[PDB]
């Protein structure tokens, strides 16, 4: 069954969409003279059992001026995909390090179907506590050859499709009081194209296909992710499901939601939003990038949306901060 | 049995890899007053039966001016992942069109294991048949609202991965005489980190594992794509296998390959290369970027060797017209 599902999506994945007319993108052509940053990093294990690595970024004319902002960036992929050392998130971290200034924690987290949900919120909340553990312990200043100054009181989380999904669950958990992880303070959470699910489906997930998502792609990652029997109204995929977490008894730290037009995932994410925008006492950012398909910040480096969406973070950061 | 290969894909596919070391890298800083270029695109099929579609790019202000050539883009993904759509590999075709003033045409192909190989091949092939049907009967007209003009007698196939092995498989297929498509002419040949296979392992083969490929992922790769039972020392994995073409009798047209220094691949593609160099009548250029993974040309856009690959294909081509 689980093998059956596995050979279905292969199919999906790399099925992609046939343009019905003509379009036009534009293009950064090569230019001399670009403005350049180094960026050190390593990684370590932050979860010995399960063997689960991190990767750490230090901007490094940065750090030398000031005690750096933690982010703590988890990559999308649907539960199924992704590792921090894959070109296409390390390229993403290596921005997020150099253009926001910050120290970037990048963690592995178990995939699904071999680990279905809640184990990938389970290690996220293991990033947060080895986290907690290097800053109580001066970990720190043996992260890299040199010394490294960070300030823990001034963390975010940045996550990415599932990793947005993921970002929610631990906004929720220190938001409900239930974890606290003193000195480490988590100021506010960036959701990008945040991977929620419903049973039944928005106008937008009924849409289009876009270049690489579709409907049935996401619908099979929620079957290979929720446990066995689990519908797409599990909490775990449905902030809004009849179980889900009563969320206006819960003080959730400023959110920032962005999301491409033309995304399946931007009216459950639109509607996340406002709904959390009339609860009050909760400061929630929502932004569209219009004509944008999933990822277009990390798809498309060079491109304009993905530089603004960069100055937005780091905009975001400072008014926090 | 293939269900179980499934399963053991994803496992590799996203495991990753752990840095011994603290490392650095280099990052391209945003940058006001870029310059930019439009580039015009459409879907169309190309073979129907198959369903099988493939994307025409074409650069606005570079086919006002002359007769464009024409790029043969095949992407890679190890026979088994994939789509012209992919925000990847449509981030890269639209850097070839741009860069190279090129038409470029990007196909989607059959995928292992569903349709092993050689279906890929075939599918190739049906691709530069299409292509020779557009030519002789002025469908060049009618791929864009507007007018395009081509240059059929200067064709250049680029393939990446997977699609080197093609681009090689093509390679053989015209300069045995086999298949021949005037006005249809392909100057050169262009094999980006070509996955080419063997039972023997080379040194690199051995070597470190990278940021995404591993030697069980290739391995598996040719497990799912090759038909069953099937070596490695097939020809359609390995130029140089027992029962692969005699190339000494063959005519290839000029070849570059170009390979990243830490690439598992590396050797294979230097052995393929050198070994057609000794041939005579051979031209072949070998290009190793030194310290560099596979696939670093469309996995960092903005980087320094990404714009020097394109540099060097465009001089290729030059070269060549």
Redesign the interface.
Known sequence: Q???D??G???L???????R???????????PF??????????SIYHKPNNL?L?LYKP?SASNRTALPVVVFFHG?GF?????????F??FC??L???LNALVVSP?YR?A??HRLPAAFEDAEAVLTWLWDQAVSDGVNHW??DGTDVDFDRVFVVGDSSGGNIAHQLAVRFGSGSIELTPVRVRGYVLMGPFFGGEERTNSENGPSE??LSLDLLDKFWRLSLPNGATRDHHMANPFGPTSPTLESISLEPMLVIVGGSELLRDRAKEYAYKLKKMGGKRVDYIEFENK?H??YS????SEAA?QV??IIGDFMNNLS
Chains 1, 2 share one sequence.
């Not at 994945?13 to 343009?19: A, E, F, K, R």
């Not at 995909?81 to 296409?88: E, T």
Request: hydrophobic share 35%; aromatic share 8%.
């Open positions: 689980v093998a059956e596995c050979m999506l292969l199919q994945l790399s099925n992609g969409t046939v343009l007319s003509e379009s036009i993108d534009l293009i950064t052509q090569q230019i670009k403005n350049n940053q180094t960026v050190l990093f390593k990684d690595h990767r490094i992929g199924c995909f992704g590792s921090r050392s894959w070109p296409h390390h390229n290596l921005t390090a150099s253009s592995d995939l179907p071999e890299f050859e270049a690489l398909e990822g277009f798809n498309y480096p060079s530089e960069l100055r």
